[PDB]
Amino acid sequence: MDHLPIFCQLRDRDCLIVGGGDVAERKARLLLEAGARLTVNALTFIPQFTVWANEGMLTLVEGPFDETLLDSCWLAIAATDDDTVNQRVSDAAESRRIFCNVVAAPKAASFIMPSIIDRSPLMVAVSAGGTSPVLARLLREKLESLLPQHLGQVARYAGQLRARVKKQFATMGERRRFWEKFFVNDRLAQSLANADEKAVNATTERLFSEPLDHRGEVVLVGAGPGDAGLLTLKGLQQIQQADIVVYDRLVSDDIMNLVRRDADRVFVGKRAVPQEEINQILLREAQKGKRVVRLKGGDPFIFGRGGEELETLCHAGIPFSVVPGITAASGCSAYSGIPLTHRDYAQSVRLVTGGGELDWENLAAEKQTLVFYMGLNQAATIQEKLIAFGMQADMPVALVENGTSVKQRVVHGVLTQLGELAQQVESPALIIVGRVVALRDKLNWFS
Amino acid sequence: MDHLPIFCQLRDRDCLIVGGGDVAERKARLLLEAGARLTVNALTFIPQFTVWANEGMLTLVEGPFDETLLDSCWLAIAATDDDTVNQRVSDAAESRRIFCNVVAAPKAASFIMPSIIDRSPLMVAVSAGGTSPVLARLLREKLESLLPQHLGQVARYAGQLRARVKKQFATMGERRRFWEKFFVNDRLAQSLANADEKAVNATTERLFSEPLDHRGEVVLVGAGPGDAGLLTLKGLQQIQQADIVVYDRLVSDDIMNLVRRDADRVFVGKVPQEEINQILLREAQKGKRVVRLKGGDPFIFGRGGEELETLCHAGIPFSVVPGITAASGCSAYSGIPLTHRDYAQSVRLVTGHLKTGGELDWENLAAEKQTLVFYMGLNQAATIQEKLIAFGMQADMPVALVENGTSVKQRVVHGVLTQLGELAQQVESPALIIVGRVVALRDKLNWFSNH
Ligand SMILES: Nc1ncnc2c1ncn2[C@@H]1O[C@H](CSCC[C@H](N)C(=O)O)[C@@H](O)[C@H]1O
Ligand SMILES: Nc1ncnc2c1ncn2[C@@H]1O[C@H](CSCC[C@H](N)C(=O)O)[C@@H](O)[C@H]1O
Ligand SMILES: [Cl-]
C-alpha cells in the first residue's frame, strides 16, 4: 500500500479542472455526479461545457491557467494536452496542499482516480496505482456483472432497519443470518426500486416472521440458446444466489459451469419425465425454505411451458419471478447472420411449433419469416404443404443447429431441398423460412 | 454518487490523528503503511503508540487538541470519545479545507475510510458509507475470494513493462491488445508466482512478437428493453471495452451508466438511417472499437441489417450480440406468457406501420391460436381493432398494452378487443400491443408490480 484509498464527500466543495477538451469532460461529469462545486479553466471549451454552464451546473473561466482559482479548492485535476501547463497546475496545488491528479500521468500527482462501481451509498473502487489500467477495467467489468443495480436501494433501507434487528435478534450470529437473506431478497429489491411501499412492508414482515432458515422462492431463468455469454446479468446474479438449480439438457454445460459449486442440482431433462413431476420437484424443494432456480433453455415463456410451472406455485403462496432470456430464434438469427426482419422483406416474424392442427394456408402467405421450433421430424411434410399451398419454390430456407455454440452447424439452400437438408441436422435445430435467409452470404460473421 | 473515491499518495505528507485509543491505533497503522508523516495528539496513549514513537515512526503530542497542529496537514482524523472534541477537530479541518474523518460520525466530516482488499499494488476499496457496515463486510469477504493471490505479481510486472510497451507499440489500439493478452495468460501468472524467470521471459518475448490487429470493429449490441439487468454478459463486455458508443432514444439511462466512463458517446435519436450508416462507418475508420447500442434485439425491427450491409464490402469486421426483444421482456414482466399449452401454437411479431403503401394481411393476422404482438402500432390502434374484427377475430378477445416494459415506470392496461382504441389513448410511446388469450393469464402470473 503506497496509495491510501479514501472516499471523499464533495457536495458543495470547490474543485478545479484545468483543461477544456474531451478528457476534462469525462472528469467533469464524474465530479458533477458527486456534487462538486466545479470550475473549469481552459483556453477553450468543447460545446458540452457551454451547455453545462448554461444549465447553471458549473462555472467556466476562459483564459490561461490562474493559480488563484485554487484559492478555495479541495481537489484539482490537470487534464490538458500540455505537459508544461499540467506541471504548473500540479505545482500550484502541492504548495497549497490540494490533492491533485494528472490524467496524463499517475506519478507526479498526489492522488489517482480509480475505476468505480457505483451503487450509492454502496461503492467499490479498484485501482492498481497506474501499473495496469486495463486489468482494473477487467475487474470493473466483472464487478458490474455481480452487483445488482438496485443494491444501493436495499443498502439504504438496511439503514433505519438496524433498529429492529436487535429487538428481534439477540446474538450477532443470527443477526448476520437475517442480514444475509435481506441483501439477497430481490422481491424486496424490486419492491424498493418500484416504490411499491406495500410490497415493501409485506416482505419486511415476512422477513421478521418466517423462520430464519426459510428463504423459499422460485426464480424461472432463461439460459439462452447455448452461449454462456448470452445469459443476462440478473440471470447470472440469480444463479449465484440459488440454493437449488433444476435444469434440463437444453441448458448448456457452459451455463452450468457458472452455477455456484456449493448448490444442489436436479437434472430434470431426458436421458434416452412428464411436466407434472417437474412441477412437484419445484413445489417440493421450495416449501422447505430453499431459494430455488428453475433454469430453462432459451426463454421460459416461449415454448418452455414456463406458464405451467408457475401456476403450480401460485396455489401454495410461493413467491416467484421470471428473468427472461434469448430465445433460439434471436440467437440463431444473430449467430448466423440471418436477421428476422430486413427492409420490406417481411412484415412479421412467426415463431411456430412442430391436440389440433397447424393452419397451412396461413403459413404460406408472403411477407413473413417463419421460424419452426421442434420441427425437424415434421420437416418432410412441411416442404410438401408449403409448395401445395402456393409458396414460391425458390424461397430460401435454413436450418440452424446448436445455434450460438462452438459446434453450430448451418445448412441453407432452397425450399425445394427442405426435406433433404433436414436429415443433415439433429435437435436442437431451427427451421427458418423466407427471403431474409438470402442475407447470410453478406452477414454471416460467425463461421 | 454520494462519495468520490480517490487514492491518495501519502508519502512524506503530514497527517494528524487526534485521540489515542484502540480506534486511533487502527487508523494510525493504516496511515503508516501508506508512508505518511504522522502526528498523534491525545491526552493519553495506549502502549502501541509508545512503542511506535520509540522507533521514530510518529510524533506524539500529549495534551488537549491543538488547532495549530493542523496547519501543515493533508488529512485529519478525529478519533476521541468526546463528540465535543471531535467536532472542534472537524471544524478546524473545514476552515483549512483539509479532508477530515470522524470515526463516530460517518455523516459529518469529509472522507470515509473504506474496507481494503490488498493485492499490492492492486487495491479494491469497499464501503457502504455508514448505512450498512454488514453489507460492507459481506461484500468485502466475497470479493476476497474472487481475486487470486498472484494478482499482485502480474500487476507489479505490468508496471515494470509499461515503459517497454510505450516505446515498442505506436498507437493506443495495439497497446490495448497487448494488455488484454497479458492479463489473461495463466501460464504467465504461474511463472511469476513460481519466480521462474526463464519462463517469464520466454512468454514475454513471444507476446511482444505477435502481430497485432490494427483494424477497428463494429459490434451491434442488443441493449434489451430497459431494465439494466436484462443486458447480456457479452453485451456488458462490449460496452465496458468500447471506444465509441452510438446509442438512441430507446436505450435507458440505467443501461448508459454501464458504459466505460472514458468512452465517447454519440446520440442518434431526436437522424435518418444512411447517416447512422456513415457515422458508424466513419468512427470505425479511425480503427477504434465502435459499439452500436440498440434497444431490444438488433434483428427484430432495429434495421441492424442495413447498418452491417455497408461493412461486408468496406472490409470492416463486425459481429452482433443479441438482446432481449421487447416482446420477451414485456411478457415476463406483465405476467403474460407468450405461449401456453395450446392457447397459442404460434406468436406473431408485427410492425405497426408499413412502407407507406402495402396493407397488413389482416386475414392472416386474424387467425386463431396465436399471440399477436404489435411493435410501434400505438398510433394505428384503432385501425387494428377495426380490421381484426372485420376478419373474424372475436370481440371479447383480451388485449394488453405494456407501456415502458421492464422499467420502474411500467404501466399495463388491459381489456378486450373492442376497447383497444381507448386503451391506446391512455398510454404513450414506447408501447407494445399484446392480443390473445394468454392475456387472461395475467391475473395469475403478474409478479412485477401493481404499477
Ligand atoms: N441452441 C439451439 N440451436 C438450435 N435450436 C435450438 C437451440 N435451442 C433451442 N432450440 C430450438 O428450440 C426447441 C426447444 S423448445 C423451446 C426452447 C426455448 N424455450 C427457447 O426459447 O428457445 C428445439 O426443438 C429447437 O428447435
Ligand atoms: N420497453 C418497451 N416497452 C414497450 N414497447 C417497446 C419497448 N421497447 C421497444 N418497444 C417497441 O419497439 C418499437 C421500436 S422497433 C425496435 C425494437 C427492437 N427491434 C426490439 O427487439 O425490441 C417501439 O415503437 C415500441 O413499440
Ligand atoms: Cl492502475
Author numbering:
A (entry chain B): 1 to 272, 277 to 358, 363 to 455
B (entry chain A): 1 to 270, 277 to 457
Give excerpts from the publication:
Siroheme is the modified isobacteriochlorin tetrapyrrole used by siroheme-dependent sulfite and nitrite reductases (SiR/NiRs) in catalyzing the six-electron reduction of sulfite to sulfide or nitrite to ammonia. CysG is encoded by a gene fusion between a C-terminal SUMT (CysGA) and an N-terminal bifunctional dehydrogenase/ferrochelatase (CysGB). The N-terminal enzyme module, CysGB, is a three-domain bifunctional dehydrogenase/ATP-independent class III ferrochelatase12 that performs the final two steps of siroheme biosynthesis. The C-terminal enzyme module, CysGA, is homologous to a well-studied class of SAM-dependent uro’gen III methyltransferases (SUMTs) that catalyzes the methylations to generate precorrin-210,13.
D104 has been implicated in its chelatase activity but its exact role is unknown. Alteration to alanine results in an enzyme that cannot complement the cysG deficiency and is inactive for both dehydrogenase and chelatase activities. The D104A and D104N structures were determined to ensure that there were no gross structural defects that arose from the alterations that might impact their function. Indeed, both altered enzymes were crystallized and the structures are largely similar to Met8p. In the D104A structure, there is a slight movement of the DAPK loop in the closed, but not open, active site, highlighting the asymmetry of the active sites. In CysG, the D104A variant is catalytically inactive for both activities, supporting the idea that the side chain serves as a general base to facilitate proton abstraction in both reactions. Both D104 variants show buildup of a fluorescent intermediate, owing to the active SUMT.
